[PDB]
């Protein structure tokens, strides 16, 4: 079908574009602004990595991020899936943004670490765009970090360490009962100077790996770290 | 255990009847209307199928649907389980409704299609009853269709195609952050003339099968299709 | 890592202490009362058992229970995981409470019964403490019973029978859509005289076993029963 753009085994992620959406359907979608041309990125496993990949798609095109929704999923693991809707006036521009997001998944899964007992996720950008803003609460135009661990108490200690490492501005802390879809994740989000934000995210990574390893298995990443 | 009526491997579904429920317990249950005789249908996998099966049970007896509740479940998949409470004055009537519901499971899973990456669900009736109304938002006395895909973005495209196929009336569109238990499903519900609703549901099926197949596996149904 | 206290294979449970938590983080944690020393118990599988183990920790130390949060988890099963935060003035007292919690897991999983289709959980104490109060709604200083079944309809029948066995006071009934994180559990909580509360919890256990066994498998417990 013409609406299909591509699919990836990374997170069971599918990208599609609707050139002219039915108006009655559009009136039922919870979007920030209606556009007739929609891009759709949808996955079983991952929230942060697809959101950061879509930020690159936004930087590369005239598309706007208009909805981010939050399935509890990861196919039985402890985290989220993701639905991201983008909007613009040009179907070609929408396909390009979805293609760029698909091509960035192997990078944004760079600091996702898996084990039988749980997982860690780290994200970093020197300049956040629209998807990171709508999806993760980033301040647009500024540095952003994300520091997350599962089961959730690991994320609390990762967060304590990150804040003690450098002078950064906390945006939010989300947990199983507040700001997640009852996931088993503790997540610190921050802004500040880019060098300080990087320092804090790297500190969180080191303590998170040490703690998750105490269940007996070295946490494994499937792609090279970008941070 | 006199309360037990039967159990089915389809959906891990169990049906029970309480002839005269304890008043203290009844006062803590979240029902639309109090009755002393309760039937209970409870499952790990499925919402829609058990709800459409119960609609036949309601048509067959004098029982009323008084609660429908929404576990996020499917034993690690992207969907819902279900709790249905029915109320009346006659224990034999309640047991008959539960038996009719269990007997209809093999039919109402006829258009559920499974794959490693996700699933599709379609439902259709020429005349909806009280369980379809309370559970899925159907208009009682009218034709009803349900069109669902997972991961949720597939459900958005299915919905668009259905509405463009025939003149039908939209009821709702539910998604991971609106009107589900943080499931990974996009679901369009419709009414209209029975022939038009049937055409829309069949169109949604065709595009959903094409899209979900793009992950590499043809979606599988375990039972003959009824639609 | 000096924050690490211990890890258990039972429920994938990890315990940690932060001697002096960062103040910006503390302001973003959802606690009843601020303390500078935090203990943290975090797991993938179990709510009631870790909460009951933590009630012993509280009895043994000067720590106060200040948060209980509710991941929908059990690694693809029908239940919850758990995050428990405790607070006090002394890091040694915190580590002792976490230690006592870890050491009681093998007891508080004594009346958890598992099967392919679902699970049962019973808890009992003659005198509830701060964790059972915050996490499960117990009345501090009184006897307390928890009676749960999955899929949730089984919990409804267990609750009805328990109430019919002895004169007890219902505290709450939680279900997929009310007072759970969209879990597939029906759970009755009770107080009253210790003898009558034990009577009721034991009656709920018997009927739960009989019903869950209707799917074809004798439910299995991994530790000796304490009730």
Please provide the distance, in angstroms rounded to a whole number, between the alpha carbons at the two ends of chain C. 38
Alpha carbon A4 to chain centroid, angstroms:
22
Q: What are phi and psi of C217, to 5 degrees?
A: -125, 130
Query: For chain B, which chains pass the contact test of at least 3 CB pairs under 8 Å?
Result: A, C
Q: What are phi and psi of B109, to 5 degrees?
A: -95, 5
Is some CB atom of chain C closer than 8 A to the CB atom of A34?
Answer: no
Name A73's Cβ contacts closer than 8 Å, sequence gap at least 6: A44, A45, A79, A80, A81, B78, B184
- Convert C175-185 to b/e letters by CB count within 10 Å (16 or more is b): bbbebbbbbbb
Give the one of A16, A75, A76 whose C-beta lies nearest to B153's C-beta. Answer: A16
CB atoms under 10 Å from CB of C220, counted, come to 10
Cis amide linkage into residue C66, ω under 30° from 0:
no
Query: Do the beta carbons of residue C63 and residue C57 sit within 8 Å?
Result: yes
d(C-alpha A80, C-alpha A70), whole Å: 6
Q: List, as ranges, residues 162-221 from A with C-beta within 8 Å of B.
A: 181-182
A156 contacts C29? CB cut-off 8 A? yes
d(C-alpha A212, C-alpha A74), whole Å: 18
List C-alpha distances in Å: A101 to A79, A80, B84.
Answer: 20, 18, 41
> Beta strands A4-8 and A13-18: pairing type?
antiparallel
d(C-alpha A171, C-alpha C131), whole Å: 30
Give the one of B77, B157, B183 whose C-beta lies nearest to A16's C-beta. Answer: B157
Give the HSE-up count for residue C198: Cα atoms under 13 Å, Cβ half-sphere. 8
d(C-alpha A150, C-alpha A184), whole Å: 6
Residue of C122, C120, C141, C121 whose CA lies nearest to C130: C141
CB atoms under 10 Å from CB of B130, counted, come to 18
Residue of A47, B97, B44 whose CA lies nearest to C215: B44
Is some CB atom of chain C closer than 8 A to the CB atom of B18?
Answer: yes
Chain length of chain C: 227
d(C-alpha C157, C-alpha B16), whole Å: 8
CB burial of residue B60 (10 Å; 0-12, 13-18, 19+):
middle
> Beta strands C37-43 and C13-18: pairing type?
antiparallel
Name B93's Cβ contacts closer than 8 Å, sequence gap at least 6: B37, B61, B62, B63
Q: How many CB pairs under 8 A join A and C?
A: 110
Residue A161: closest C-alpha in chain C = C22
Q: What is the dihedral of CA B45, B50, B51, B56, to 10 degrees?
A: 170
d(C-alpha B85, C-alpha B30), whole Å: 10
Q: State the nearest Cα–Cα gap between B204 and chain C, in angstroms.
A: 28
A151 contacts C83? CB cut-off 8 A? yes
Chain C residues whose CB is inside 8 A of the A156 CB are 16, 18, 25, 29, 38, 40, 85
Is some CB atom of chain B closer than 8 A to the CB atom of A75?
Answer: yes
B184 contacts A182? CB cut-off 8 A? no
Give the one of C4, C28, C182 whose C-beta lies nearest to A214's C-beta. Answer: C4
A78 contacts C4? CB cut-off 8 A? no
Q: State the nearest Cα–Cα gap between B155 and chain A, in angstroms.
A: 10
A75 contacts B151? CB cut-off 8 A? no
Q: State the nearest Cα–Cα gap between A76 and chain C, in angstroms.
A: 4
d(C-alpha B125, C-alpha B146), whole Å: 9
Q: What is the dihedral of CA B31, B34, B37, B43, to 10 degrees?
A: 0
Is some CB atom of chain C closer than 8 A to the CB atom of B24?
Answer: yes
Give the one of B9, B30, B42 whose C-beta lies nearest to C153's C-beta. Answer: B42
Q: State the nearest Cα–Cα gap between B194 and chain C, in angstroms.
A: 32
CA angle B28, B81, B38 (to 5 degrees): 40
Query: Do the beta carbons of residue A42 and residue A83 sit within 8 Å?
Result: yes
3-state helix, strand, coil in chain A (%, to 5): 35, 30, 35
Which three-class secondary structure state does DSSP give residue A116?
coil
SS (H, E, C) chain B: CCCEEEEECCCCEEEEEECCCCHHHHCCCCCCCCCCEEEEEEECCCCHHHHHHHHHHHHCCCCEEEEEECCECHHHCCCECEEEEEEECCHHHHHHHHHHHHHHHHHHCCCEEEECCEEEEEEEECCCCHHHHHHHCCCCCCCEEEEEEECHHHHHHHHHHHHHHCCCEEEEEEECCECCCCCCCEEEEEECCHHHHHHHHHHHHHHHHHHHHCCCCCCECCCCCCC
B14 contacts C154? CB cut-off 8 A? yes
Gaps after residue numbers in chain B (C–N over 2.5 angstroms): none
Residue owning tokens 């709508």: A134
User: Which value, in Å, is the radius of gyration of the alpha carbons in chain A?
Assistant: 17
Is some CB atom of chain A closer than 8 A to the CB atom of C116?
Answer: no
Q: How many CB pairs under 8 A join B and C?
A: 112
Indicate the DSSP class of residue A76: G
Tokens of B63: 């029982």
d(C-alpha C48, C-alpha C131), whole Å: 10
Query: Do the beta carbons of residue A71 and residue A39 sit within 8 Å?
Result: no
Question: Which uninterrupted H or E stretch holds A28?
Answer: helix A23-28
Tokens of A9: 């085994």
Query: Do the beta carbons of residue C36 and residue C84 sit within 8 Å?
Result: no
Give the HSE-up count for residue B72: Cα atoms under 13 Å, Cβ half-sphere. 34
Which three-class secondary structure state does DSSP give residue A9?
coil
d(C-alpha A146, C-alpha C219), whole Å: 42
- DSSP annotation string for chain C: -TTEEEEETTTTEEEEEESS--HHHHHHS--SS--SEEEEEEESS-SHHHHHHHHHHHHTSS-EEEEEE--B-GGGSSSB-EEEEEEES-HHHHHHHHHHHHHHHHHHTTTEEEETTEEEEEEEESS--HHHHHHH-PPTTS-EEEEEEESHHHHHHHHHHHHHHS--EEEEEEBTTBSSSS-S-EEEEEES-HHHHHHHHHHHHHHHHHHHGGGSS--B-SS----
B183 contacts A71? CB cut-off 8 A? yes
Is some CB atom of chain C closer than 8 A to the CB atom of A153?
Answer: yes
Indicate the DSSP class of residue A139: P
**A88: which strand partners?**
A37
Question: Which uninterrupted H or E stretch holds A90?
Answer: none
Query: Do the beta carbons of residue A184 and residue A118 sit within 8 Å?
Result: yes
Overall resolution, Å = 1.6
Query: Do the beta carbons of residue C212 and residue C115 sit within 8 Å?
Result: yes
Name A10's Cβ contacts closer than 8 Å, sequence gap at least 6: A46, A105, A106, A109
Residue owning tokens 């790996």: A209
Is some CB atom of chain C closer than 8 A to the CB atom of B22?
Answer: yes
Residue of B105, B107, B26 whose CA lies nearest to B67: B26
Chain B residues whose CB is inside 8 A of the C152 CB are 42, 69, 71, 83
Tokens of C174: 């939680």
Please provide the distance, in angstroms rounded to a whole number, between the alpha carbons at the two ends of chain B. 37
Name B150's Cβ contacts closer than 8 Å, sequence gap at least 6: B77, B78, B79, B118, B119, B120, B183, B184, B185, B186
List C-alpha distances in Å: B150 to A22, A42, B13, B197.
Answer: 20, 9, 22, 21
Residue C18: closest C-alpha in chain A = A157
Residue B73: closest C-alpha in chain C = C78
Which three-class secondary structure state does DSSP give residue A166?
coil
Tokens of B70: 């929404």
**A7: which strand partners?**
A14
Residue owning tokens 């099968």: B209
Alpha carbon B115 to chain centroid, angstroms:
19
B176 contacts A71? CB cut-off 8 A? yes
Give the one of B6, B21, B81 whose C-beta lies nearest to C184's C-beta. Answer: B81
């Amino acid at each position: 079908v013409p609406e299909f753009v591509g699919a990836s085994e990374i997170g069971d992620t599918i990208g599609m574009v609707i050139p002219r959406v039915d108006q009655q359907l559009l009136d039922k979608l919870h979007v920030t602004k209606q556009y007739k041309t929609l891009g759709i990125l949808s996955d079983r496993t991952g929230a942060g990595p697809q959101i950061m990949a879509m930020d690159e798609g936004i930087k590369a095109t005239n598309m706007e991020c208009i909805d981010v929704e939050w399935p509890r999923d990861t196919k039985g693991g402890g985290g989220h899936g993701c639905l991201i809707i983008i909007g613009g006036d040009d179907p070609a521009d929408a396909r390009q943004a979805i293609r760029v997001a698909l091509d960035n998944l192997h990078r944004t899964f760079g600091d996702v670490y898996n084990a039988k007992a749980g997982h860690l996720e780290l994200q970093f950008t020197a300049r956040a765009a629209g998807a990171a803003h709508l999806g993760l609460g980033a301040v647009e135009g500024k540095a952003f970090g994300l520091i997350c661990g599962c089961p959730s108490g690991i994320g609390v200690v990762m967060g304590d360490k990150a804040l003690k490492t450098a002078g950064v501005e906390p945006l939010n802390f989300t947990s199983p009962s507040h700001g997640t879809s009852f996931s088993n994740e503790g997540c610190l989000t921050i802004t500040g100077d880019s060098g300080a934000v990087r320092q804090a995210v790297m500190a969180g990574r080191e303590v998170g790996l040490k703690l998750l390893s105490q269940f007996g298995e070295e946490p494994v990443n499937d792609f090279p770290s970008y941070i």
